[PDB]
């Protein structure tokens, strides 16, 4: 069994997502997406061997038939997926792309001389990598995995296939204290203005705690605003709101599209709802009542409520969040709010394996 990612960070934290190109993995139709993992020869788990993008049902070539069933079996791209490690360590960001350079090279050779068989649970040449499959039912084959022999390819990674996901303190959303916040608070959905905004229209309100108040107004504001613009942009029914009767052609197939996911840029992970555990009963009270009226005054009743109700009722931005990750003491943790960078920036750049 592959494990779980760990939850817990004493800080912001960081994983990272790799599609490979030049292979494909073919596995039974409804296999479970995890097949294998790589770990330090020490025992720490580094990244997830993973099906990704459905390339079609999977074809044995005639001249590699092994009397075995391939019945129904699908073909997928891998992709590499990372146990998070903390931002600011190191030698875990680095293990962890050294690891996935390793494992293309493993792969490079697999498809040369054991093209169309699954890959086996080996220790790297240097003894620092190990190989652990979870799933023995699959097979590697070079490019689509239609001919029983290989082009020659050399296993390679691109920004194109690449994503990063921190993870933060949703405590520090808007405060713009870490350099990690303030990549994430120049998301272009996220609007600082709401956090003054939201102090000017609680002044005679006894807040326990007015600026915590005011991030998570701002933070949730933000994105139900960014929700209802999506939702009219792409024409995605949302609960009981639909785009067509406000004129709207529907243009994507909801809101874990991947088209939707990129208009995002920096996507939101964890399930919005979560963020009021952060606030006392009372605060999360007057943060709630005052998100209503921002998107009255940009929305139709119609979509605002639908909005409105879809994340009170633990609603998701873009399918299965990633909302039991925590931050800070271990003993007394605090929510960890995570986002997908769905193109690599410049900043985070450092943290994803290069072929070249
Ligand atoms: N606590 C955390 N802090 C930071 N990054 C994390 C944390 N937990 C998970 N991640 C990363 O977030 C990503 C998780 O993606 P994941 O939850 O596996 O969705 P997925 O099902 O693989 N995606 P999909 O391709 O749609 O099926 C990976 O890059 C992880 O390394
Ligand atoms: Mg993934
Ligand atoms: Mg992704």
């Known amino acids: 069994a592959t494990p ?31 097949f294998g993992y790589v770990k330090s020869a020490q025992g720490d788990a580094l990244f997830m061997l993973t099906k990704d993008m459905n390339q079609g049902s999977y074809q044995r070539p005639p001249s590699l038939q092994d009397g075995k069933n391939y019945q129904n079996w699908q073909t997928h791209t891998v992709e590499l997926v990372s146990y998070p490690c903390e ?24 498809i040369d001389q054991s093209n169309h068989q699954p890959l086996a649970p080996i220790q790297s040449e240097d003894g620092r990598f190990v190989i652990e499959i979870t799933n023995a039912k699959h097979v590697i084959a070079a490019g689509n995995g239609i001919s ?35 990549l994430l608070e120049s998301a272009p959905w996220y609007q600082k203005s709401l956090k003054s905004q939201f102090a000017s229209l609680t ?30 942009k792409f024409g995605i029914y949302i609960n009981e ?15 874990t599209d991947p088209k939707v996911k990129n208009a995002w840029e920096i996507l939101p992970r964890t399930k919005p709802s979560k963020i ?26 119609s979509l605002s409520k639908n909005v409105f109700q879809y994340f009170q009722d633990g609603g998701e931005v873009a399918g299965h969040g990633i909302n039991n990750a925590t931050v800070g003491d271990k003993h007394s943790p605090e929510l960890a709010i995570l986002f997908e960078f769905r193109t690599v920036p410049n900043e985070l750049q450092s943290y994803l394996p290069k072929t070249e």
Do not use: C
């Not at 600026?211 to 139900?224: D, G, K, R, W």
């Not at 709101?241 to 809101?255: C, F, H, K, R, V």
């Open 4 to 34: 779980d990612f760990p939850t817990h960070f004493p800080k912001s934290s960081i994983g990272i997502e790799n599609e490979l190109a030049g292979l494909v993995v073919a596995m039974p139709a409804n296999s479970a997406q995890k």
């Open 241 to 255: 709101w639909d785009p067509m009767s406000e004129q709207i052609t529907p243009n994507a197939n909801g809101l």
């Open 87 to 110: 931002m600011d360590d190191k030698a875990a960001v680095e293990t962890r792309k050294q690891a996935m350079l390793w494992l293309a090279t493993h792969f490079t050779t697999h």
């Open 203 to 232: 002044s005679a309100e006894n807040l326990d705690d007015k600026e915590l108040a005011a991030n998570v107004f701002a933070y949730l504001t933000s994105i139900y605003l960014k929700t209802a613009e999506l939702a009219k």
């Open 148 to 182: 029983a022999e290989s082009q020659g390819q050399t296993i390679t990674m691109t920004p194109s296939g690449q994503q990063a996901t921190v993870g933060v303190a949703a405590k520090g959303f808007g405060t713009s204290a870490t350099p990690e916040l303030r």
């Open 276 to 301: 009021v555990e952060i606030l006392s009963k009372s605060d999360a009270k007057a943060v709630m009542k005052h998100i209503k009226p921002q998107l009255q005054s940009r929305y139709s009743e």
